[PDB]
Design an enzyme around this catalytic site. Structure first.
Site: not given
Ligand code: NI
Ligand code: NI
Ligand code: NI
Ligand code: NI
Ligand code: NI
Ligand code: NI
Lengths: 101, 100, 566, 566, 566, 100
Positions: C135, C319, C271, C220, C216, C359, C218, C335, C133, C245
């Site tokens: 980034h 985020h 997660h 977002d 991935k 993460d 996600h 969350r 995980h 996610h």
């Molecule tokens: Ni995530």
């Molecule tokens: Ni992440």
């Protein structure tokens, strides 16, 4: 609490079990100290150490791996030897055997 | 100044020790890195003063006591080693069991 | 002759029956087996055993190992044993008894003129960790992770860009190509994840063909049923993994809708507790399914007194949320739940959650995956006692279950277990040597592909390597061409066939991913539990078979203030 | 629906009519235009606009951009506008409205699965600066300049050697080849200058054929009419630029003789004010000619209370002068004149001087080209008020005139404007993102060829990228092969044809210079004034059309003590 | 005209008959010759001599040097002279009079447009040092050594592994290949040593064929007569050198047995005094033989008040010895003898010991080889006065004898003197420029293959290169491809023929070793004494021709506290 | 000490704060970097002492006031964030509008 501490169970470890051994009286006739390692071919040690080189053939010191026996000049003492294993081929040292035995 | 890599490296040790020094002053029990840095920096200054290696090997065992550090720390440091420029050049100071 | 057990341990490290405390935790491991022949242990040094004609033989390079780790205490998912480890051609050659067959018995790892020695007596050796995980917000993360004991990093990103700050995605062929090229400069094995949020298959196939080993999904970028189905369809045909996610906002549906969209296909849920993202408040119920490989990110591991307090503002920045926008703050709060955060620790202890990950810099700490995994184990032993699987008076089983979380399981989940993930013959020699007092916190040596890549190093001008200041510095394994030879860049089977490595002129060794579609929860080593878990929509209480799952927050943790300067 | 202007600015950055203060100066810019459609702005983040089917479309990589900078406030020589910026293949694709044509109107920059996002709302975006007066004294200068917002560096040198300490010259084929090879390791576009001081043409042609993009004529190597004529003859035939540092000693003639030697041919005059070198005391009169492209070095910008005091000893060390040798100190003093230093600021404000540069570590500060250019603008607004060209209640025109000094004008002067220098379609994507409070001082992101190369980065192990300590760290765009792909090494047309890149095995992208002979003062954007300027031989007073040109020294400047730790 | 001698020295550096103090020692050197023509010295700078038509000519690059070091005071084994040094194609072109033959007389080093200038007036220039006892424990050692003035490093290792901690051995083909690849990243010339401890010739031939330029025989791997004979047999057939660390334990025989095993074949004995390893207590008697090239490691140089005290614990860590094991501590003590440590200094002064080396991080300081060599010279002058060979009132001869110890002699011993080791035409241009006040302590410039590789550098953003903080930073010669072009990787003749460079894809320049078997003690420049030396078995007293050899320990040394921050 | 990259990085923050501390002591109005460093270092020591995240989020807003910093500085710092090893591991402290 001691970080990474050991909790060794009491007792003793028997080393080199089930192998032929022999005792030899050795005397340092040189004027300088001689120290011998656990796995050195005893029969090929420094020529100044006087003992029955014939009896020590194919043997090494019967002591824990990595340790040694020191002989100060003129020092005489009895050591216990244990026979080599594996292929029982000796290469190196003073180059006296350079082959099996 | 023409600082060589080793001089700049020691500046890191000196600064780490300033952190420990201030914490010891507040009355905190030092942790592992803080203890090593404090005793090490002490020795480097000892060499700058002109003390002998022999003297420092002894004096270094009296910088911190078991009651000034966290539990387990004394056992995490069986010895401390540091080099510094003595009047007679670079020498290595080894302090065995510095914390007791 | 004879030697006492204590003296023996001081010289060669512990043997069968001896126990060792892991760092400053309450976890104790007991040596299960010792592959040596007492009296024939190999030791290196002045006047020791490894010398010509003695512990070292006369064989040519081809008939002996390049490197031997002597008297190592191995801690891996398969056992906690004392043995010598032989490494040849950058790979694990054997686990056994090292020495010279000419004079020693039972030698399985021959030492010759071509053999280097690393003395591991009194040290614990483990496989290098695998963080799935990542980034890629900055390249400095690789050094931080390597120093912690992590040798493989899977994730996505293009640098400190908004898209990467929030998601693990390297968008499109151009950025993917660029990052594959940049990867040659990093001292860790790397695999990239592309952006899987699209309802047009071809836009995904392009990315896979360009080099990504996974996609991935996600929220977002829109975690909709349509996007999810599309990514899984492409994953099924190209043998790559999908990391999810989910839709926290429940905008397109609830957790049951997402699960339905997945339709029993293999997927790695990131997660799974939810704080890092996912259907509020029940994304955690995913760990009940056979096709879901569930992982936790590290800030919620383990549950402590300050955990909740730090989460809100961390959530916002990660985020790009506006604290002045009510809807933005309400969804951030939905969350963060004490109930699911506390339950997560227990689910790990039970084997319901199978992986731990960071993460990195997006609600996670890159250098704390290993450290936090062990803090959870400690807290669980303290609270719940011995696991039902324990045998003997030690924590051996709990240790095997937890080490699997950041080693073999992540490897299986992402299709790279044929190359890395554990200490088994034929796998890349990514090993980490630890002193028991610093286990899981600060490694003594980090080995990459058979070469030491980073290690603590004292004064460079000193007479020995030990004088202060001692801090982590890059070694030869992290330098130029030696690095290229000792690291792996993972590619999808399609990219490998398309000649991507040749086209981009990648210098590092190449490895291909496979088996991403066939792994299921039952395959996760020591962590295959599928509990009948439920989450109360109103109270957020987690229950397994009706019983309430929970734990208490720690006020103080091991592997913390005793080791760090800041 | 409807939204208030303030709330709008907080979410998407300012729009038409809103004004923004540049850092802590008195300069205000007003948004001239906004290319968006209100209500259709793209925003990235949890539950935002850029998501599958919404702000993100279904197109393949070929039909969408690789990177989009959303809601950016562009400040360039052509305008101060609000727009989205699309980058594709490392180049500027378009300036317009980004999004998904499937559901949004007026989309000119399509966002797809292959698109990365950089959120620029509330930020100012500019082209990367171009410093054409670099002394390659040390490689560390490239990082310093990049961090300041400069992405292209043109100069000469071989390291900390006496020749380079004093002049911007990379002498001969061997050193040129060596420096072209070393350039691949630096994260900035680079072009080299050879030693142009010779009266034998072939010795110059060799250097050009070896790779230099220009020739430096320096008095330390003899700035004689013969050498000057020789260099210009070769420049005219090989399409390269000549940079001049004239004969301060008036040893071979006065300024009128040098000008006569130039004979109306194109030439870039370095530090035209004179403190950095040049006919004493009237080299500044060169800015009156049509064939002269005049620049200033930065220590004299702007005129402040401590300026004069620091100059003497700086002069000495930079030119290997002996303070004990009377003639050495007398010629140092004849270069430092309060009269010309004060006039220089005004001449910049009027557009008589067209470029700003550093003169790195040889009477100049490599990280202060941009910063000082803005301090001059501020001081000029404060002293002289609005320019005759201003329209509206803002400083928009003065801002366009000054930004041109370190971006497009240096690019035009050196024949590289086809590749870099401004934010226009088809040019390399070298962009700098700034937060208004730190404009011109400390960038938020520095982009090289479409990849972020350096940016402020917080704690590497932190849960987010923002925790302290935050300082500039190299990103993926500055790493190995990714760097090579994102930077340019400029060569002369002859070198390119001779296969120099192949022979030296240069890894970076290659660009060729052209149009160095045809540029004239009239071509300098917003800085084409040719004033009837005179310098009084006795008093050193500068006059334009008989009127005295002068200014007052600042006691305090913006972009100074409020931002720097030291 | 006329000029006073003092004014002359201030402008061009000292001339014939002038004396200069070396740092803060009691050593004075006197200029023996000056190759200039008074009035025709070349000087660079504003209005100086090196300008077009004047000191600079009209020749093409092929007919002039790339670099000239003006007015340098050369200190080398062959003389202490004032001259200009010309460098062309990375090699020493000539030592003579630089300038323009068009207007100047006696010009032997033509300066043209292609010539860079380094002003050496007032500075001392020497060849780069050569350290033949490197333990590759970490790569950072290369920067430390380069900064001290050492440009060639010969040794062995694979990183911080137990084998390397104790011995200078890069075991086998795989590790050798890996280290040859890693070497391209280091800014120093490198040659590797393999593990020579084996009684099977083929295991040695493989290593030589893989790339090593020598074999290390170390007692930790078994320094037996059989192993020694085997290594020497292979060395004799492959033209490589053998470095020996004898059997301290006298386990296989005494020093006379080892000498007998060597059988008059060429061999380099490491740390011949014995503290670093060797037959106790008489390994020092080896310096009496014609086939032995003897060196000292640096911690015992020179004998000081704290020397003995620091040695015990240093010994232990370096050889993985256990202080609790009596035999381990007894053999450590038998190596530390005040008697042999004191005698070593004198033997160096007499020329019986021919080399100095570090023994980096394994009982030696990598950045102190040069510094300690001069401290010994100082201490010897102070104690013993002038050498029998001195002529005039200076220490010129003692200086030539000592500089040879870390330059030409190590080069001859290892078969690389055809490439490096002294300032002679045709040799690689590895030069070190020193200011007299910092001679042997902190260099002003370190040149590698004609390019400056490291030097002190002040504030990067400063207006000049001199402002604080000034510290050593890597220059262009240490960057990417420029580095590859300016360094050498030495290979054995067999490796070169086998195409090892092509196979491993080595980027640096390749040099081959030769003449390792034919060098003897008589060939060591200024250090060829073969004394009739004896060591008393009981008292350890060293005697030469019956006379007792000894010295007194220093309480304070020059080149120490006056220069270092720590 | 075995300092990891993150520990060495924090030494930079600590040193930056020493600079600010000495200037504040002379009675100077701190600038932007000096303010961020001083408040950040304060929080790190708070964590070493064992204070909770909640307490520090509050206490951090009382280290410097608007009258101790230069004009515009308070507006340049909408918040300060720093992580440190608390007794319960690494935690993030976020101080909103630290200067008022
Ligand atoms: Ni995530
Ligand atoms: Ni992440
Ligand atoms: Ni100039
Ligand atoms: Ni200049
Ligand atoms: Ni040795
Ligand atoms: Ni050694």
């Amino acid at each position: 609490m001691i970080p990474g501490e050991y909790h060794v169970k009491p007792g003793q470890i028997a080393l080199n079990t089930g192998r032929a051994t022999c005792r030899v009286v050795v005397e340092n006739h040189g004027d300088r100290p001689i120290q011998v390692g656990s796995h050195y071919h005893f029969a090929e040690v420094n020529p100044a150490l006087k003992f029955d080189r014939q009896q020590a053939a194919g043997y090494r010191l019967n002591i824990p791996a990595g340790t040694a026996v020191r002989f100060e000049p003129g020092q005489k003492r009895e050591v216990e030897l244990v026979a080599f294993a594996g292929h029982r081929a000796v290469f190196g040292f003073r180059g006296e055997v350079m082959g099996p035995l | 100044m023409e600082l060589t890599p080793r001089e700049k490296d020691k500046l890191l040790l000196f600064t780490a020790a300033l952190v420990a020094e201030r914490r010891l002053a507040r009355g905190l029990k030092l942790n592992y890195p803080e203890s090593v840095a404090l005793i090490s920096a002490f020795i480097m200054e000892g060499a700058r003063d002109g003390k002998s290696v022999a003297s420092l090997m002894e004096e270094g065992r009296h910088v911190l006591t078991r009651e000034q550090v966290m539990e387990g720390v004394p056992e995490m440091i069986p010895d401390i080693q540091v080099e510094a420029t003595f009047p007679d050049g670079s020498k290595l100071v080894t302090v065995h069991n510095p914390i007791i | 002759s004879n030697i006492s057990r204590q003296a023996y341990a001081d010289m060669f490290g512990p043997t069968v029956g001896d126990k060792v405390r892991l760092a400053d935790t309450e976890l104790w491991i007991e040596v299960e087996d010792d592959l040596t022949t007492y009296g024939e242990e190999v030791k290196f040094g002045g006047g020791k055993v490894i010398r010509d004609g003695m512990g070292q033989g006369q064989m040519l390079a081809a008939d002996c190992v390049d490197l031997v780790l002597t008297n190592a205490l191995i801690v891996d998912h398969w056992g906690i044993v004392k043995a010598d480890i032989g490494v040849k051609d950058g790979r694990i050659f054997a686990i056994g008894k090292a020495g010279n067959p000419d004079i020693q018995p039972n030698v399985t790892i021959p030492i010759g003129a071509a053999t280097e020695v690393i003395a591991a007596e009194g040290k614990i050796v483990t496989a290098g960790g695998i963080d799935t995980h990542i980034h890629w917000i900055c390249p400095q993360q690789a050094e931080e992770a390597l120093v912690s004991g992590v040798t493989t990093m899977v994730g996505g990103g293009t640098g400190p860009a908004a898209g990467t700050h929030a998601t693990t995605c390297t968008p499109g062929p151009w950025y993917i190509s660029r990052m594959l090229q940049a990867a040659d400069s990093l001292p860790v094995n790397i695999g990239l994840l592309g952006k899987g949020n699209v309802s047009q298959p071809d836009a995904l196939r392009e990315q896979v063909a360009a080099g990504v080993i996974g996609l991935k999904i996600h929220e977002d970028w829109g975690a909709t049923p349509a996007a999810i189905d599309c990514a899984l369809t492409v994953a099924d045909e190209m043998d790559i993994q999908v990391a999810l996610h989910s839709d926290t906002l429940n905008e397109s549906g609830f957790v049951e809708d997402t699960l339905a969209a997945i339709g029993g296909r293999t997927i790695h849920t990131f997660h799974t507790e939810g704080a890092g993202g996912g259907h509020a408040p029940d994304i955690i119920t995913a760990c009940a399914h056979p096709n879901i490989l569930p992982s936790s990110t590290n800030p919620t591991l383990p549950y402590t007194l300050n955990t909740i307090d730090e989460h809100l503002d961390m959530l916002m920045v990660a985020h790009h949320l506006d604290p002045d926008i009510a809807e933005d703050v309400a969804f951030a709060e939905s969350r963060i739940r004490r109930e699911t955060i506390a339950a997560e620790d227990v689910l790990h202890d039970l084997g319901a959650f199978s992986l731990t990950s960071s993460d990195s810099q997006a609600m996670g700490r890159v250098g704390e995956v290993i450290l936090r995994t062990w803090q959870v184990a400690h807290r669980m032993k303290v609270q719940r006692g011995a696991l039902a699987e324990e045998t003997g008076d030690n924590d051996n089983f709990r240790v095997k279950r937890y080490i699997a979380k950041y080693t073999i399981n992540p490897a299986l989940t992402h299709g790279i277990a044929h190359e890395v993930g554990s200490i088994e013959v034929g796998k890349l020699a990514d090993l980490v040597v630890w002193s028991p007092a610093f286990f899981g916190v600060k490694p003594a040596t980090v080995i990459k592909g058979g070469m030491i890549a980073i290690a603590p190093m004292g004064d460079i001008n000193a007479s020995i390597p030990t004088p202060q200041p001692v801090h982590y510095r890059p070694m030869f394994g992290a330098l130029g061409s030696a690095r290229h030879h000792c690291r792996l860049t993972f590619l999808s089977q399609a990219a490998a066939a398309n000649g991507v490595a040749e086209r981009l002129n990648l210098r590092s060794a190449i490895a291909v991913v496979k088996g991403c579609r066939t792994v299921q929860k039952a395959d996760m080593v020591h962590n295959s539990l599928q509990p009948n878990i439920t989450v109360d929509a109103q109270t957020y209480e987690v229950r397994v078979d009706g019983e309430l799952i929970t734990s208490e927050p720690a006020d103080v943790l091991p592997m913390a203030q005793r080791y760090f300067l800041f």
